[PDB]
Design a protein around this ligand. Structure first.
Ligand SMILES: *[C@@H]1O[C@H](CO[C@@H]2O[C@@H](C)[C@@H](O)[C@@H](O)[C@@H]2O)[C@@H](O[C@@H]2O[C@H](CO)[C@@H](O[C@@H]3O[C@H](CO)[C@@H](O)[C@H](O[C@H]4O[C@H](CO)[C@@H](O)[C@H](O)[C@@H]4O)[C@@H]3O)[C@H](O)[C@H]2NC(C)=O)[C@H](O)[C@H]1NC(C)=O
Ligand SMILES: Cc1ccc([C@H]2CC[C@@H](C(=O)O)N2C(=O)CN[C@@H](CCc2ccccc2)C(=O)O)cc1
Ligand SMILES: *[C@@H]1O[C@H](CO)[C@@H](O)[C@H](O)[C@H]1NC(C)=O
Ligand SMILES: [Cl-]
Ligand SMILES: [Cl-]
Ligand SMILES: [Zn+2]
Length: 578
């Protein structure tokens, strides 16, 4: 009995490695070369992996896991009992796979065109407009145009996608797809836990929001900014207003303490995408962590092809499930933001390499937020003025309180501004999946949450037929989002713990863990666990305690909270958007 279950997981692991490796290859070939042929091969491989999933999932469901003694075998078998989409009848499975491919293709090839003019792609063209234009009408054209082309085109697919992903979830024992996604955390209190963390970040977010709102009022004019209302969503430097650091120039706390133009510094000094990933590789190996294999440099797609190919440009990291072949696919631009993206993606690769000797069923992060946090933790140190100066991308900014608050503001524009965005995406999707939001009010309920949590409003009233969530990658690609909220909380917990392990003293935000082998050892021990244990054990290995907690993020930003309260007080800001 115990013997049959052990043999079963060994057979599952051997066959899964082969089949998943073949699927990853076809998926990569489409993502890096969108054509009719690669799409047809991918859809064929979808049916092949579904045949495998159904074979072994059916066998797994014949084991009574209650009666099994070994907890690891119990854990693997319970997981394999979830067939995901392979639980669907063949007709519905084929339809679902086609819908998913059609949605992700639509998003990745959408363009926004001037009339009798050029056509802009999201990356780099529209991204650059949102980041650098300071003309209200030009930002509006990009913001509205992207939603008109990408968002509206996804709406035809989304109701059927919801029906089918929910049907698959119910056939695997869940009430709906959102229930199945939340289960990845193995934390029954997840919704309350995340709500409590969100509430703890409200003082910081509300003060940052009011300060930025004031600065936008100064630049774009009193007729366009209501000092007691929500901020128009196209003015924050980012297509989704999810991170705001590209408008640092408008909101600099101490303009008498100017910062080097990091983009021009990277270009002037001959930085390339390959150099950016080599720097990230060096940071990981400086902690005693693993270098990427030579194969990574041969097979990765680190810049947008020029040979005519259409590609999925959205950055991602790829495990080919053979313990040797790991790759990044990124349409890298030479700027500081994409340097942080490169570190994010290299953190995924590091996790892949750390747990490569686990059975594939356990080759995941402790929870999905852990997988998202690794690269960001290192990027926190990379982003310090100390480290950036050592890269010759900033001048010496130390020994200056003005520079200090400026740096904290730069970090807050990304890290704090993202908290409400990353919270609300799956608040919306969970309610779509549970049927509380129907296609009658997809977009209205999206903007109700954009208002409630982020304090943003659409610059143009939305109309029937708009489907603005479809204009955000993870929606048509069916990638869960709450992982990023979890990641932004725990990455500061990890930073705090690794800084203590490295012997750092003084303010948390001055810590740079570069070359700390003690810090690397903490991360390595946790990453090697993969998904073999409940995530509180990995939390404990890194931080010395088992809970998610906002206290580390609050500690990091405490000096900025103090400065923002003083600044907002003396300007008489009314926090929030009553
Ligand atoms: C429950 O079952 C799990 C899983 O068992 C494994 O999978 C089954 C399907 C079946 O194939 C089993 O035969 C198979 O072991 C058990 O977890 C495993 O436990 C073993 C032994 O503790 C671990 O073996 C380790 O493998 C490492 C490979 O990288 C190796 O380096 C380790 O060696 C270390 O320890 C020796 C001790 O002298 C030391 O000399 C070495 O130098 C080195 O430090 C070690 O051999 C597996 O990694 C575990 N696998 C997983 C997935 O966790 C588990 O023990 C069992 N539970 C109970 C209560 O028995
Ligand atoms: C500077 C910076 C740093 C990090 C990001 C990350 C976090 C926010 C989120 C977002 O931009 O909203 N973000 C990505 O999206 C990156 N890319 C996905 C791809 C995930 C994927 C999973 C499965 C299939 C395909 C893709 C991934 O690495 O996690 C953004 C920007
Ligand atoms: C793109 O895909 C087509 C069809 O599969 C193939 O013939 C072609 O060689 C591919 N191009 C590249 C650059 O891989
Ligand atoms: Cl939007
Ligand atoms: Cl998730
Ligand atoms: Zn990620």
């Amino acid at each position: 009995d115990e013997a049959e279950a052990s043999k079963f997981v060994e057979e599952y692991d051997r066959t899964s490695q082969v089949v998943w490796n073949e699927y990853a290859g076809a998926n990569w070939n489409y993502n890096t070369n969108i054509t009719t042929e690669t799409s047809k091969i991918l859809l064929q491989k979808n049916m092949q992996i579904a045949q495998h999933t159904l074979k072994y999932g059916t066998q797994a469901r014949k084991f009574d896991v209650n009666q099994l003694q070994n907890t690891t075998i119990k854990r693997i078998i319970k997981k394999v009992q979830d067939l995901e989409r392979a639980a669907l009848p063949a007709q519905e499975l084929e339809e679902y796979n086609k819908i998913l491919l059609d949605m992700e293709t639509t998003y990745s090839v959408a363009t926004v065109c001037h009339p009798q003019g050029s056509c802009l792609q999201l990356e780099p063209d529209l991204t650059n407009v949102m980041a650098t234009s300071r003309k209200y009408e030009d930002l509006l054209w990009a913001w509205e145009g992207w939603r008109d082309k990408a968002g509206r085109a996804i709406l035809q697919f989304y109701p059927k996608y919801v029906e089918l992903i929910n049907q698959a979830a119910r056939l695997n024992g869940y009430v709906d797809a959102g229930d199945s996604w939340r289960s990845m955390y193995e934390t029954p209190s997840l919704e309350q836990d995340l709500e409590r963390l969100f509430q703890e970040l409200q003082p910081l977010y509300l003060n940052l929001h009011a300060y930025v709102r004031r600065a936008l009022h100064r630049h774009y004019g009193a007729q366009h900014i209501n000092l007691e209302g929500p901020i128009p969503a196209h003015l924050l430097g980012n297509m989704w207003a999810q991170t705001w650091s590209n408008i640092y120039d408008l909101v600099v706390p101490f303009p008498s303490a100017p910062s080097m133009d990091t983009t021009e510094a990277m270009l002037k000094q001959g930085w390339t995408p390959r150099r950016m990933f080599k720097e990230a590789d060096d940071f990981f190996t400086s902690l005693g962590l693993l270098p990427v294999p030579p194969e990574f440099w041969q097979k990765s797609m680190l810049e947008k092809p020029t040979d005519g190919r259409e590609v999925v440009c959205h950055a991602s990291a790829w495990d080919f499930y053979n313990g040797k072949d790991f790759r990044i696919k990124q349409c890298t631009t030479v700027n500081l933001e994409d340097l942080v993206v490169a570190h994010h993606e290299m953190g995924h690769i590091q996790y892949f390499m750390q747990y490569k000797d686990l059975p594939v069923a356990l080759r995941e992060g402790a929870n999905p937020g852990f997988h998202e946090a690794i690269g960001d933790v290192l990027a926190l140190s990379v982003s310090t003025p100390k480290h950036l100066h050592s890269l010759n991308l900033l001048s010496s900014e130390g020994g200056s309180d003005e520079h200090d608050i400026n740096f904290l503001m730069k970090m807050a524009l990304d890290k704090i501004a993202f908290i409400p965005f990353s919270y609300l995406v799956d608040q919306w999707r969970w309610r779509v999946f549970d049927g509380s939001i129907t296609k009658e009010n997809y977009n209205q309920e999206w903007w109700s949450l954009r208002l409630k949590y982020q304090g943003l409003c659409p610059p143009v009233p939305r109309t029937q037929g708009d489907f603005d969530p479809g204009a955000k990658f993870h929606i048509p690609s069916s990638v869960p989002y709450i992982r990023y909220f979890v990641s932004f909380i725990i990455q500061f917990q990890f930073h705090e713990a690794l800084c203590q392990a490295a012997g750092h003293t003084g303010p948390l935000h001055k810590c740079d863990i570069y070359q700390s082998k003690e810090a690397g050892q903490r991360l390595a021990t946790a990453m090697k666990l993969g998904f073999s244990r409940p995530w509180p054990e990995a939390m404990q290995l890194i931080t010395g305690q088992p809970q998610m907690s906002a206290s580390a993020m609050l500690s990091y930003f405490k000096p900025l909270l103090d400065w923002l309260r003083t600044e907002n007080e003396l300007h008489g800001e009314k926090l929030g958007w009553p």
